[PDB]
Amino acid sequence: AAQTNAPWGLARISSTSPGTSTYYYDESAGQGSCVYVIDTGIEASHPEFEGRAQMVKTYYYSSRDGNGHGTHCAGTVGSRTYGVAKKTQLFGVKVLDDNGSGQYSTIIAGMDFVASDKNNRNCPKGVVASLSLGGGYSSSVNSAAARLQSSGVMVAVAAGNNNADARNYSPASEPSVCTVGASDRYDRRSSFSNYGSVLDIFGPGTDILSTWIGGSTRSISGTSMATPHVAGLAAYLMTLGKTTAASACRYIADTANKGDLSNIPFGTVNLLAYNNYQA
Ligand SMILES: [Ca+2]
């Protein structure tokens, strides 16, 4: 399949080179996989989701995304126009309030929720979780992300936006999950992206067009936007049978575009997520 005039980040994850605008992907498109978006919620009724999105848990008075961030992330995972895995099922877990913040105890509860709830969903090709959130180091938050990964979910987490070593942030610093940094359309590390030896991979994170609340769309930037590209890529690859939840981060790193990013500090991977699709 070929989607012309796609958002630059979609075009990038199916290209060996920057500067193209068509997204190429296998038509299976993540069908039979599931991605949990653990964030501010998802505006499920948005047509871009085509009935494939549903809120499954909230820790607040409503399950509505009153912020937009979670809807944007879900759109990069799996919206029809803006998504990597255009046929995946999307499950929203609202651990962040409408101001975009959440207590660590609530975030931990939401991770444990996903580890159990996947047994209530039909995801024959595999389960992914996209965590576009984080704060300072917490061994409890890292442990919860480790449990989620151990349960058989591919966990993708944002490196953080501090232009610093991700070792000091959670869940970014948990070794066993897939920690995602952000790049721009000219293959530079995004100025704000954290770095360090705990990073596994980079994805597109600067000026990312996706869905927003009120049935709308907008471009925004962050490692929060890079993470859902990797989560959607994992879902896509698991539907194709190329990898499993336990192996997907390593598979993505093995098949990544290698050595092509600029402003990568010494000791940080120079790997950019790539779907290796050959039509
Ligand atoms: Ca890792």
UniProtKB/Swiss-Prot annotation:
What cofactor does this chain's UniProt record say it requires?
Ca(2+)
What EC number(s) are associated with this protein in UniProt? 3.4.21.64
Report the co-factor binding details: Binds 2 calcium ions per subunit.
A biological process (GO) annotation for this entry? proteolysis
Domain Peptidase S8 stretches: 7-279
Keyword Cytoplasm tagged: no
Sorted alphabetically, the keyword list is: Calcium, Disulfide bond, Hydrolase, Metal-binding, Protease, Serine protease, Signal, Zymogen
**Keyword Nucleotidyltransferase found:** no
Where along this sequence does the record place binding of Ca(2+) 1? 175, 177, 200
Q: Could you tell me which cysteines form disulfide bridges?
A: 34-123, 178-249
Q: Which family does it belong to?
A: Belongs to the peptidase S8 family.
Its function? Answer: Hydrolyzes keratin at aromatic and hydrophobic residues.
Q: What is this protein called?
A: Proteinase K
Q: Describe which stretch of the whole protein the shown chain covers, with first residue, last residue and complete length.
A: 106 to 384 of 384
